[PDB]
C-alpha cells in the first residue's frame, strides 16, 4: 500500500499543535457494586465512605474498594500511600482497573471476547518495593470509577492510602457561551453534549478518549459543527484538515483516520464516505473560520476525492455494490450500502461545486451536470412507489440509512423527502440505527424538510434516554432496544465518551430550540 | 517495641555506603521448557533458536518464549522493540515473567500457597503506547530465565524484538585470586560460591538477591569469612557492624535484620543466637581488618548481647527452653532448639573473652569462670553416654545440630568430640539438616577435631550435588533426601542465591583444601 508524505502541509499541521492544560481532582465517594438486573448494564452502586475515612483505613491482602471520581475524566492517576503496623518486609503488590461504567470494574476483563483489541481495556499492576510512596502513573486513562485491590502484602504490615486525585487534560481550556434554550430537558443534554467534546478534544480531536484516542475524518466531521458554536478553536479544524491532506495514499485518496504518535502516519484503511467528508469538513471550515487561503490550498485534496469516488458508478450512475468495508454508514453489519452511500456522493458533490464555483469556476459547469445524472439515476434505479422508499443493494434491502442519506442528498422534490420522513414515523424499515453518528443525520434530515417539532422531540427521546440512564458524556454506541449492544463483541470496549454523539449541542444553539 | 537510634554510629554507616558498578549482558538462547520427571525441579530446557533468529521473528497476540540468560544475574532489564505489518492501532500488552530455575516460568505463580507474601514472585506488566519502543525497567530483578508473552496485539500488526540485554549490579566488581585447589571438583564447587557471594554483595550483604535483599546477622557472619578470601571489602563488613549497632532494642539488643530504605530501620525481629553473632562477626573484623578504633568503639554493643544473653540461664547455667522462635539455628520446624543454643552462647561467650582481654580486661576475668560453668553444665544436664550424644529438651530430643554447636562450643575433651563426630556418621540422629547453613557449621566441626579427609568428602558430596544438578550460585534450602522442601511452602519462593551456602570458597582457600 503506497503512501505520499507532503512535508508542506505536514509543517502547517505540526505548528498548530495546542498546548494541553492540565487541572487535578480528587474523587467524591468510595462505593460498593450490587449486581442489578434493572440498573446501568446490571450494576448499582452504593456510597458507603467518604475519603476522609478511606484514608483512615488499614488494608491487608485481599482487600480492596471502588472509587467514585463523581464525573468523567481523561488524564494521569496520582497516589501517596504507606506502611501500618511492623516495618514493611516486602513488596506490596496492586492492581488497579479503570471504567468510564461501573460494569467496567465489575466485570472481569479475562472474560472478554471482542475482534478489537483487549490491550485497550484499562489495568495496571503496581509492586512497590519501598513505603511511604508517591506514584504518578505516566498512561492516560479514561475513566470514572477506579478499583484498587491489594493482591499481596506480608501479615507482618498493611497498606494506607494518604491521598489520590486525577490530573484531567484537555485543549479545551478557553470559555463556553452557555445555552440559551428555556427548555430544562434540552440544557441537561447539552451539558452532557459539551463535556464529551471537551474530553474528545486533546492534540487532536479523537473519537474517544478511551478508545481510539485517534482522529478519524467522519468524527472530525461532526466534532467540528459543535466546536464551531462551544470552543471555537478554529486552529484545531485547520490542523486536522491539513493532517489528512498531508499524508495520503499515492493516488491521492485521503486515509479514514490519522495516528501522530510517535510521528504523523496516515493508516492504511479507506473508506468511500470519510474520503468525501474532507470536502464538507473544508466547506463547513470556510463558513465558520473565513479562511481563505487554507481552503485554496487544500482545494486540490478536496477536487481529488471526487473524481476517486465518481470512478465507483457504473454507466448509467449509481455506485456500484460490494462485500468489502468500503464504505462506513454506521455499525450494523446487515446493512447493506449502495443507496446510503449514493446520496453521501451527491451530498459531497454539492458542496464541491459550492467550493469551485471561488477556486475553479469552470469545473463547476460540469459538476453540476454530473449533479443532475446522480439524483436522476438515485430516482430511476433506487425509489420504490410501492414501498415509499429508497430500496439497496441487489436483494433490494429497505433501511432506515438509505432514506437519510438520499433526503440529505436533496434528491427529488421537498414535498417527496417530507413524505418520506413521515414514512419513517408510522412505517419504520427493517434495518434499524445503532448509533448516535446515524441518528445526527436523521436529525439533520428532520430540520431540512421542516420537521422543527419531530426533531426536538427526537433528541430528547433518544439522547434523554442516556441522560436518564445516568450518562455523564454520550456513548460511541446506542440502540435503545438493545442497550447491550456491541459491534465488537463486548460492550466492555465500547466508549462511553465518544463526540461523534455530542451534535445535540450544535442542533440547540445553532437552531435555537 | 520501643526502639533506640544512635545518630553517630549510623553517620559512619553511611560513609561507607559502596559504589554499585553496572555491567551489561546478552542472553545466549531461545529454550522450550518440556515437563521431565528426572530432571531440576520437573523441567528440562532444550535450546531452539539464537537470539539474532528471534530478532527476526513476528510475534502475535498468545506468542511467548523462554529466553535464557546462561548464568545467575542480579539487575535491570532493557529492550527494544518495534512493529511490523499495518501501521500499530492499539497497544501492545506484554507479560513478563522472571526466574532463578526454569520451574519459575512453567509453574503458574496463580498457584502459590505459602505463609511470605506472593510480590516476591518476580513478574509485571506493560502496556505500549507507541511503537518503536525502549524499555528500561525500573526494578531490580534476580533471574536466569525470562519468560516474554504478548497477550494481546490486534490482527493488523505484529511484534518484534531487536535487541535484550540485562544490566547486572554488585559492589564486588573489584579483583579476586584464583583458588589453588588441584581437585578440579573442588574448583568447580569455588567458582559457583564465588559467583553466589558477588550477586548478594550490594549496598549491604543481601541474604538473597531475589529475596529478601536484606541484611541479616547470621548471614552477615559467613558472607564476612567468605569475602576475607575472596573480594576483601572490609568497608563493607564494618558498615554492615555499625548498622547493627545503631538502631538497637531499647535495652540494648540488636535486631536480627535490619532495613535500608527508605531510611535505616532495624526490624522488630529479636533471635537469641544471631545476637550473640554480633560478637564473632566483631572479633573476626578484628582478626582480618586489624581495625582496633572500630572494635574499641563497638564493644559495649558485644558487651550487651552477652549481658542479656546470660539472663536465660537458670541457676544451674543451662539455658531456658520454650516453644516460640526464640533462637533460629536451622529452618527445621521440628527441632528442639535448647542444647544449640547452649552452643551458640559458649562459642560466643569464648570471643566476648578474646575481646574482653583487649577492652576490658577486669571482665574477661569472671566471663573465663562463667565459661567453666556453662561447659559444666552443658555436659551434666545434656550428655547422655548411653547414647554417646547430646539431648535437648524436657522430651530429650536427638537432633544434628545439637552435636554440631555443642562440638563447636568445646565442652568436654577433644577425643570425645571425635567420638561425638564419628557416631553422627555410625547412628545418624533423627532430626536432620535442611540449609547449607548448618551445613556449614557440620565442617568447621569436622575440621576443628582433625578429620579432614572427612570434611573434603562432605564438601563434594553435598554442594557438589547442587552442582551436578547444575546450579550456576548455591540455595538457600537444601535437603539432599527431600529436593522439594521449603519452609515457606513453595519452592518457588526459596532463594536460589543465597551467600549463607558460599562458605565452601572459605574452606577450600583458608585451608587450602
Ligand atoms: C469506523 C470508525 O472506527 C470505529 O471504531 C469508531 O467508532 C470510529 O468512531 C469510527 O469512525
Ligand atoms: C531466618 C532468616 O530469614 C530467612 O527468611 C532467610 O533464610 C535468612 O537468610 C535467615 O537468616
Redesign the pocket.
Known amino acids: 500500500v503506497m503512501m505520499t508524505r507532503h512535508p508542506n502541509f505536514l509543517r502547517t499541521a505540526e505548528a498548530l499543535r495546542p498546548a494541553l492544560s492540565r487541572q487535578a481532582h480528587p474523587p467524591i465517594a468510595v462505593v460498593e457494586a450490587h449486581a442489578d438486573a434493572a440498573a446501568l448494564f446490571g450494576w448499582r452502586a452504593e456510597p458507603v465512605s467518604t475519603l476522609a475515612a478511606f484514608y483512615q483505613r488499614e488494608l491487608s491482602s485481599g482487600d480492596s474498594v471502588i472509587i467514585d471520581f463523581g464525573s468523567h475524566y481523561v488524564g494521569y492517576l496520582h497516589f501517596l500511600c504507606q506502611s501500618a503496623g511492623s516495618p514493611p518486609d516486602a513488596p506490596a503488590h496492586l492492581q488497579l482497573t479503570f471504567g468510564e461504567t461501573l460494569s467496567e470494574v465489575c466485570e472481569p476483563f479475562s472474560d472478554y471476547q471482542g475482534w478489537l483489541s483487549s490491550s485497550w481495556l484499562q489495568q495496571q499492576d503496581l509492586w512497590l518495593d519501598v513505603l511511604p510512596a508517591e506514584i504518578d502513573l505516566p498512561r492516560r486513562y479514561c475513566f470514572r470509577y477506579l478499583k484498587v485491590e491489594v493482591k499481596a502484602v506480608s501479615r507482618k504490615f498493611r497498606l494506607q492510602f494518604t491521598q489520590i486525585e486525577v490530573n484531567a487534560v484537555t485543549s479545551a481550556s478557553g470559555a463556553c457561551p452557555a445555552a440559551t434554550t428555556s427548555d430544562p430537558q434540552l440544557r441537561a443534554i447539552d451539558n452532557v453534549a459539551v463535556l464529551t467534546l471537551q474530553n474528545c478534544m486533546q492534540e487532536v480531536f479523537e ?2 478518549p478511551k478508545r ?1 484516542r485517534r482522529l ?1 475524518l ?2 472530525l466531521r461532526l466534532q467540528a459543527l459543535v466546536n464551531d458554536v462551544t470552543f471555537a478553536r478554529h486552529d484545531l479544524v485547520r490542523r486536522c484538515l491539513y493532517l489528512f491532506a498531508g499524508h495520503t495514499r499515492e493516488d491521492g485518496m485521503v486515509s479514514a483516520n490519522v495516528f501522530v504518535q510517535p510521528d504523523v502516519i496516515a493508516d492504511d484503511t479507506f473508506l468511500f464516505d470519510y474520503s468525501l467528508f474532507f470536502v464538507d469538513v473544508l466547506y463547513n471550515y470556510l463558513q465558520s473560520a473565513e479562511d481563505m487561503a487554507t481552503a485554496r490550498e487544500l482545494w486540490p485534496t478536496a477536487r481529488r476525492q471526487v473524481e476517486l469516488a465518481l470512478t465507483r458508478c457504473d454507466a448509467s450512475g449509481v455506485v456500484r455494490d460490494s462485500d468489502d468495508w468500503w464504505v ?1 454508514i454506521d ?1 450494523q453489519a446487515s446493512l447493506n450500502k449502495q443507496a446510503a452511500a449514493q446520496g453521501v456522493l451527491i451530498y459531497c458533490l454539492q458542496r464541491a461545486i459550492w467550493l469551485a464555483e471561488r477556486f475553479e469556476p469552470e469545473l463547476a459547469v460540469s459538476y453540476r451536470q454530473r449533479l443532475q445524472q446522480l439524483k436522476s439515476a438515485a430516482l430511476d434505479a433506487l425509489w420504490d412507489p410501492q414501498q415509499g422508499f429508497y430500496v439497496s443493494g441487489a436483494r433490494r434491502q429497505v433501511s432506515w440509512a438509505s432514506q437519510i442519506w438520499l433526503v440529505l442528498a436533496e434528491v427529488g422534490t421537498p414535498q417527496q423527502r417530507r413524505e418520506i420522513m413521515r414514512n419513517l414515523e408510522k412505517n419504520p424499515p427493517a434495518v434499524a440505527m445503532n448509533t448516535p453518528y446515524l441518528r445526527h443525520h436523521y436529525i439533520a434530515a428532520l430540520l431540512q424538510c421542516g420537521l422543527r417539532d419531530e426533531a426536538i422531540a427526537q433528541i430528547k427521546a433518544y439522547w434523554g434516554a442516556m441522560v436518564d440512564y445516568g450518562a455523564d458524556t454520550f456513548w ?1 454506541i446506542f440502540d435503545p432496544a438493545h442497550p447491550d449492544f456491541s459491534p465488537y463483541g463486548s460492550k466492555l470496549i465500547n466508549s462511553y465518551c ?1 463526540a ?1 454523539s455530542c451534535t445535540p449541542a450544535w442542533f440547540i444553539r445553532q437552531y435555537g430550540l
Open positions: 473519537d474517544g481510539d478519524w467522519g468524527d462506513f455499525w460511541e465518544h461523534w
